[PDB]
Amino acid sequence: KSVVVKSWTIGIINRVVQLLIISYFVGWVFLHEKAYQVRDTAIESSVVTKVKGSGLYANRVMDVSDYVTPPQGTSVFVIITKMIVTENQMQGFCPESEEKYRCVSDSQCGPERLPGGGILTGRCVNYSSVLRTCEIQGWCPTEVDTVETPIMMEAENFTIFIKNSIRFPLFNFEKGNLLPNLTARDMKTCRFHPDKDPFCPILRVGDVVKFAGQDFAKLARTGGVLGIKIGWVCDLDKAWDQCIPKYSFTRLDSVSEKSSVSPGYNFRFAKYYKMENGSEYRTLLKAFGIRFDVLVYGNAGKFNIIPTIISSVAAFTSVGVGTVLCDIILLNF
Amino acid sequence: KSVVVKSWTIGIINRVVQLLIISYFVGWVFLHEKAYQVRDTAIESSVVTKVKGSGLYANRVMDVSDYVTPPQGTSVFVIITKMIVTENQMQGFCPESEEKYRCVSDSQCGPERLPGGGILTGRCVNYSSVLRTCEIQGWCPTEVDTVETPIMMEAENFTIFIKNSIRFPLFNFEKGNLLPNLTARDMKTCRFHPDKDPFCPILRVGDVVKFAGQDFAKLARTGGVLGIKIGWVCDLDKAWDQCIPKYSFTRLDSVSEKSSVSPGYNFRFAKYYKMENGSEYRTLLKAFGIRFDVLVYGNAGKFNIIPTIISSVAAFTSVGVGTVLCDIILLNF
Amino acid sequence: KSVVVKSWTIGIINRVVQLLIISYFVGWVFLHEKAYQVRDTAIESSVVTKVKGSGLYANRVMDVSDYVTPPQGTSVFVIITKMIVTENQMQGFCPESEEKYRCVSDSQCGPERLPGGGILTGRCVNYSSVLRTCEIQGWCPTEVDTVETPIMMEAENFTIFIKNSIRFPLFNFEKGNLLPNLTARDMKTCRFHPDKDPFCPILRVGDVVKFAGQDFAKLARTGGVLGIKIGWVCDLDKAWDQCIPKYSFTRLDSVSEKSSVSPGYNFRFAKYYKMENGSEYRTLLKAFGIRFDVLVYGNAGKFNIIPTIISSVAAFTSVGVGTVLCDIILLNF
Ligand SMILES: Nc1ncnc2c1ncn2[C@@H]1O[C@H](COP(=O)(O)OP(=O)(O)OP(=O)(O)O)[C@@H](O)[C@H]1O
Ligand SMILES: Nc1ncnc2c1ncn2[C@@H]1O[C@H](COP(=O)(O)OP(=O)(O)OP(=O)(O)O)[C@@H](O)[C@H]1O
Ligand SMILES: Nc1ncnc2c1ncn2[C@@H]1O[C@H](COP(=O)(O)OP(=O)(O)OP(=O)(O)O)[C@@H](O)[C@H]1O
Ligand SMILES: OC[C@H]1O[C@H](O[C@H]2[C@H](O)[C@@H](O)[C@@H](O)O[C@@H]2CO)[C@H](O)[C@@H](O)[C@@H]1O
Ligand SMILES: OC[C@H]1O[C@H](O[C@H]2[C@H](O)[C@@H](O)[C@@H](O)O[C@@H]2CO)[C@H](O)[C@@H](O)[C@@H]1O
Ligand SMILES: OC[C@H]1O[C@H](O[C@H]2[C@H](O)[C@@H](O)[C@@H](O)O[C@@H]2CO)[C@H](O)[C@@H](O)[C@@H]1O
Ligand SMILES: *[C@@H]1O[C@H](CO)[C@@H](O)[C@H](O)[C@H]1NC(C)=O
Ligand SMILES: *[C@@H]1O[C@H](CO)[C@@H](O)[C@H](O)[C@H]1NC(C)=O
Ligand SMILES: *[C@@H]1O[C@H](CO)[C@@H](O)[C@H](O)[C@H]1NC(C)=O
Ligand SMILES: *[C@@H]1O[C@H](CO)[C@@H](O)[C@H](O)[C@H]1NC(C)=O
Ligand SMILES: *[C@@H]1O[C@H](CO)[C@@H](O)[C@H](O)[C@H]1NC(C)=O
Ligand SMILES: *[C@@H]1O[C@H](CO)[C@@H](O)[C@H](O)[C@H]1NC(C)=O
Ligand SMILES: *[C@@H]1O[C@H](CO)[C@@H](O)[C@H](O)[C@H]1NC(C)=O
Numbered sequence A, B, C: 001k002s003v004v005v006k007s008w009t010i011g012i013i014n015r016v017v018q019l020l021i022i023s024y025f026v027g028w029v030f031l032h033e034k035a036y037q038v039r040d041t042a043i044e045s046s047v048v049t050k051v052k053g054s055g056l057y058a059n060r061v062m063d064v065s066d067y068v069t070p071p072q073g074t075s076v077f078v079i080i081t082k083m084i085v086t087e088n089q090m091q092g093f094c095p096e097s098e099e100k101y102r103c104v105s106d107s108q109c110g111p112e113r114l115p116g117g118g119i120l121t122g123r124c125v126n127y128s129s130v131l132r133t134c135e136i137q138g139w140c141p142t143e144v145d146t147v148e149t150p151i152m153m154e155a156e157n158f159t160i161f162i163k164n165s166i167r168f169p170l171f172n173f174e175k176g177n178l179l180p181n182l183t184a185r186d187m188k189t190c191r192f193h194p195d196k197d198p199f200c201p202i203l204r205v206g207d208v209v210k211f212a213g214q215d216f217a218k219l220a221r222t223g224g225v226l227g228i229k230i231g232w233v234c235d236l237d238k239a240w241d242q243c244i245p246k247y248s249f250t251r252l253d254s255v256s257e258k259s260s261v262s263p264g265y266n267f268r269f270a271k272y273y274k275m276e277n278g279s280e281y282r283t284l285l286k287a288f289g290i291r292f293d294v295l296v297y298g299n300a301g302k303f304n305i306i307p308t309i310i311s312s313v314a315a316f317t318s319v320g321v322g323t324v325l326c327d328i329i330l331l332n333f
């Protein structure tokens, strides 16, 4: 009745408020928010990785054992793209190479000097005819950062194999980026895309860098950290084929690009040798590279009667309490 | 009064609905759900590991420094159970070993060929009298996957020492798998079991594999990833001795068993050497192994008056609103 | 009216209950709990680390490549502070060094003996004139724990460079411990303090140890695990300069101090060599050290109208339902 629609000119809004209440609780809260669903947020995941590619550096070929570290194929690994190599260091005495350590007086060679190649003898010494610096005890000779060294251009073409297995324990549901019908031809020719082809396990390094919105040429020079986020948000009421990984790419060391003091990612490690003599020598390496972190996240939902009962009862109580209160507020005013 | 139990034939259900409301809110929601409790979900954990055992491989003994990687005793480590060893590689030119790279025409040796040992010379060469393949520049000779190599049978008997410390910061509560009264005799003789003996820090590899429902013989051959979940769900209202770790075991790379393309877990690393000459050579290793991930999770609860007041008041409002509404629905109908 | 304040002597409490209801819902729940705010708990973080310092050990200088492992500058690394070095091991036969393996009868050399240097020959042999022990096959000679070795005192002075970048994706908000206006002078001279100077990226190892409430002298000897928690809890309604990292320090392997059986943290790894001959030898290392785990956590909040509407409406319904019920309870009693 037109008297029902408007128990008054205000009262037509009684209906309206009810509509919002009905909509919100039975629409967004019950349905869009899938209140009827039981949720698993304790996702269980595993990631294994392999890198394939070859490159020329220092007039030598580099293969996965050369440029990947650490090697164990985890969800976090570095592809070395640039190196400063200091060959055949031995324990001894020598002058620091860098200008920062420049010396003219043995009094200048004390505690105040920045941390460098070793312990200070407190002596001063000639590095070159033009230059004199403080003397240190340690691995000799010291590293020489005085010219930029090139990157491994080829690295853009290396591939990352990601084998990701996830499980939602509550629903005994298991799936992975590698579908059971995946075949050797597929691995050989499939081309990864976050929308077009979510289940190609092979990712091209250069592609990962571009998705993260980075320029390989710059990134390889500075070194950096990229994140490969893999998201499994699955509605198990829907089809098993509807549950697919969602890939997101970003550069995790965002501070680096905005900073003058530290622009990238590098670290130092050494290769250790011994002479037949049994004297000890090593090759020092300063590795610049791209670190990849594979981060997996997920939640899964399935229909279950228990929540459906509790949520719907909650829905009726709420729509009811809402209507009862809107009437009351209206009655006095 | 019998008139109270049934204010009508329907009205006996008024009581019943009240019972469900009373039960649900003051039973499950208040008690079974421990509403009276304050909860810490920000569990703080630490894990350190050590592996002990010896094995024969390649007619040599292997000890923890040989088969465990990485070595730092973290919550994630690999026990190498199978290896393909390529001894004394040097930088140079040579023919790819695998059949996949088979050659008869130098035109066949170009970009299309799968990633392998190095960069292609574009040349073609003889690997053997029977076989001719493409030529590569890199570490030589290339690896030869043409016969299966055996596993380290003994690995089933290696032991894993897990020292796990957890803390619930809110309650200043600290406990670990290693109880304070644990003694050298105990470490020497205690036998781990998830129900029978939760605080033996020593886990037998073979046992871990069986709990994960895996066959060591197969797992060692393919390589794989097992998860050791340690759960600390503690009711601090209960006794400190009631708070014990709950161990769960599974194989994390579930995709592997269901897939033809990639059945396991392996990775490649190298050992680097130099001649007195100063020419560089390395030993290439393809390691198959079991990776163990120790994953710790927990939440802790203690009685606190503040929630007890708020929850119980919430309980009374809810039982009350429920009864008020059930009466109303009944009155009009 | 004084009749309003007290509709009765009890009824003055009707007002009071309303006050608590008003206060709680519109005070603590709406405001102190920032109900008006939209929250991001899916914090995104990255951490890169570098260690700088030199030390004397075994009458040799040790630099970052010597005492830091693993080297890749992650949020988890070890600074080796103590070592038991076993030089030039070769594959062969020899007697176990430790007293635990003491022998007089070849029958004593069987399965029951604890895991040690290798596989048992089942033979018995003389380690020294005074001592006879079981014979093993493996890397020889076996390690000798018979005298305590010193720590690297200097390690207290090493520095940790932490470059931490975080992002709250929801708000497109990015910040790091390294502010954009940070300069070379700053890195050179700034002194870290959790309250006084949260954005100095350089942390002094000894300082980290003291903040964790530990004695370096003891910690370096046993080895241990320290946690560096970095917390980003930011109110984006407030100023961008108000969002600062909060640093917390602790010792994660708490079980260790309370236990006789295992007091610290150590692990074993080896350096591998080859003779020109091509026979294989290695140097075995038992590393004691401090492991640092950088753990980043955060949540961020910003004002948003959508929650403000829903929360405030929720607030009015709750204050209203509360008052309605308190009146009712009063009317019958
Ligand atoms: N552990 C540390 N203690 C003190 N200063 C450090 C430390 N690690 C890095 N720094 C300084 O912070 C700045 C940026 O470091 P970053 O590694 O990003 O650049 P870098 O030039 O590769 O550093 P370096 O070559 O000195 O190792 C440099 O001035 C570096 O000396
Ligand atoms: N980074 C990668 N790029 C391209 N293909 C890869 C990569 N990593 C692995 N694959 C391929 O995926 C398949 C399964 O890899 P998996 O490592 O499980 O087996 P595998 O035979 O040990 O691999 P391989 O011996 O070639 O390193 C193989 O055909 C392998 O060549
Ligand atoms: N994987 C393991 N299997 C059996 N026992 C172990 C294992 N790891 C450690 N233990 C034992 O637990 C005790 C404490 O180990 P911890 O490493 O803390 O001290 P440790 O003396 O350095 O050990 P070790 O020197 O024997 O490697 C020791 O008795 C040690 O033998
Ligand atoms: O609130 C998180 C929850 O709902 C979200 O809802 C989105 C909706 O999907 C969009 O269409 C748009 O209307 O904005 C809404 C925010 O209120 C998201 O769907 C998702 O984050 C989550 O399920
Ligand atoms: O809902 C999660 C919460 O309660 C759970 O309740 C279980 C109960 O323990 C079982 O006896 C059975 O009745 O199923 C209930 C599910 O509603 C669990 O106890 C636990 O996951 C958690 O505390
Ligand atoms: O309840 C967690 C939530 O509120 C907390 O409130 C604290 C308050 O900050 C203190 O002043 C004191 O009154 O104890 C309250 C606990 O009810 C905290 O502020 C914080 O953990 C969080 O925001
Ligand atoms: C990547 O590989 C393709 C061949 O598939 C080649 O054409 C291209 O030049 C390579 N890019 C780089 C940077 O080496
Ligand atoms: C492989 O299985 C998936 C499972 O959903 C399916 O979507 C896909 O079409 C299948 N591929 C082929 C070639 O049948
Ligand atoms: C080993 O020989 C090198 C030069 O060939 C020399 O520097 C060193 O002193 C020798 N080692 C010993 C222990 O004499
Ligand atoms: C494991 O060790 C026991 C001795 O305690 C031995 O009897 C058994 O044969 C071993 N198993 C394997 C697979 O080596
Ligand atoms: C060691 O302490 C725990 C602490 O709860 C106790 O359960 C156990 O019985 C104790 N063991 C012995 C041998 O007293
Ligand atoms: C080192 O000797 C090996 C063979 O003994 C040879 O292949 C290599 O060319 C030599 N290195 C140099 C730099 O001459
Ligand atoms: C740490 O360095 C300072 C110099 O800045 C020195 O005075 C002090 O003795 C050093 N401490 C240790 C333990 O070496």
Ligand SMILES: *[C@@H]1O[C@H](CO)[C@@H](O)[C@H](O)[C@H]1NC(C)=O
Binding pocket: C179, C181, C182, C240, C241
């Ligand atoms: C650097 O920027 C931060 C940003 O909040 C500010 O707090 C600080 O005062 C600035 N430092 C200088 C020297 O201006």
Ligand SMILES: *[C@@H]1O[C@H](CO)[C@@H](O)[C@H](O)[C@H]1NC(C)=O
Binding pocket: C275, C277, C278, C279
């Ligand atoms: C290498 O020489 C060492 C001693 O110099 C000897 O122990 C070993 O048997 C030799 N290797 C071979 C394969 O003969």
Ligand code: NA
Binding pocket: A145
């Ligand atoms: Na530098």
Ligand code: NA
Binding pocket: A186, A190, A197, A199, A200
């Ligand atoms: Na595909």
Ligand code: NA
Binding pocket: B145
């Ligand atoms: Na292969």
Ligand code: NA
Binding pocket: B186, B190, B197, B199, B200
């Ligand atoms: Na026990």
Ligand code: NA
Binding pocket: C145
């Ligand atoms: Na020992």
Ligand code: NA
Binding pocket: C186, C190, C197, C199, C200
């Ligand atoms: Na500062």
